[model samples]
Target chain A: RENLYFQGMRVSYNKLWKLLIDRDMKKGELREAVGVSKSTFAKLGKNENVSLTVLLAICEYLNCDFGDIIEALPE
Target chain B: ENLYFQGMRVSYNKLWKLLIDRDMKKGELREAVGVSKSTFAKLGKNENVSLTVLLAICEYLNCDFGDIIEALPE
Candidate 1:
């Protein structure tokens, strides 16, 4: 089902962060866990949206799927 | 506020673009952009309007206080 926060073209950082945080991972730790640059990490806070690629990396490191990160929202 | 989603707009696009540029995919993309799957979706769908939302974003992706995503005045 659509999570109301997730649409087709986008994912939710809220849910993603919660999952990471719920698992006891810090922002900096998650960044390193995902293997992204600091600059890229900084840009994330500055920006409202995130690309799918970054999501995949987090999933890979976390050993989860898109479902673990995002949900479907009503359009 | 002065409706300053402009730089945030850029920051938004930058996020999407960066995910692509970095080839991050969906999983790590959340970590890279500091948004949750749902929160990130909010930005994509233009949902959410609380400063806390923005604050969280900054916490994750802030290069500067508001350099990458500028805050507007009312």
Candidate 2:
């Protein structure tokens, strides 16, 4: 299940795209609004790791649950 | 409320208390918690750190989010 991927290094950020769609915020706007570089969003899109500070900034700006924006679903 | 501190000046005081309360040493906590000395030192100095390290320490200490960090007003 989730554990296998978590330990096996399989994860995703599909939730991030969903959150963006829910808010009607374009990807570029999210980058500018959060003061994060395009690379950060790209990282989210691909399940690449980002600093917790970066994650915190994103969650704080969106006023959303951290779990809602990111998911590390099993591969 | 006691767990709350505001501004950029983060506090590791609770961590210190937790260590003392639990009869643990800094070096021991570092090894047990899987963090480097510089990371421990940064926390001690109220400096910035990666969230990855922050969550790991919380997991090791058997604590919650509010127990770990705070923001200070500059």
Candidate 3:
């Protein structure tokens, strides 16, 4: 299965990740806000994988588009 | 726009609206959460105008990208 995400690009899943952490949310804080499970949050935090639906929720709720969240490396 | 949205077309505007009601209000937040400067400012300028940004914002924050946040078609 060919991966659709950035290839050889270390995009920072960090923006939302840091934002969530800085907010000092509880164990389920991000899950509550982004409305995803621990597994999902864990995946997204590492920039591994997550449902498009979950991304939509986070972006929409956060009030941003994908460009603001994900960035290409050395571009 | 389907009549509404030709692309992913916000699953539910109302659902996205609730998300908007939750966290996005500050200026910095506009940068982190997701939204253009014009669109963000639009929220303050006009009432109905914000809904478009609201939909796209909800789209990105949720997880679904691509089809979301389309170019305002002519």
Q: Which ten residues in a row have the lowest lDDT in candidate 3 chain B?
A: B1-10
Candidate 1 vs candidate 2, lDDT winner: 2
Judged by DockQ cut-offs, the docking class of candidate 1 is incorrect
Collision pairs in model 2: B6-B71, B6-B72, B7-B71, B7-B72, B7-B73, B8-B72
Give the backbone clash total of model 3.
31
Q: Against the true two-chain complex, what DockQ does each candidate achieve?
A: 0.03, 0.08, 0.04
List runs of model 2 lying over 4 Å from the truth. Answer: A1-28, A59-75, B1-27, B63-66
Q: Measured by C-alpha RMSD in angstroms, how accurate is candidate 2? A: 8.5
Cα misplacement distance, residue A9 of candidate 2 (Å)? 10
Clashes of 2: 6
Give lDDT per model, in order.
0.47, 0.60, 0.45
Better of 1 and 3 by lDDT: 1
Q: Pick the candidate with the highest TM-score.
A: 2
lDDT of 2 by residue, A1-75 (tens): 011101222335577688889889887887776777676768777777775456556666666544556543333
> Distance from true position, residue B64, model 1, in Å?
32
Interface RMSD of candidate number 1? 15.9
Q: DockQ for the candidate 3 complex?
A: 0.04
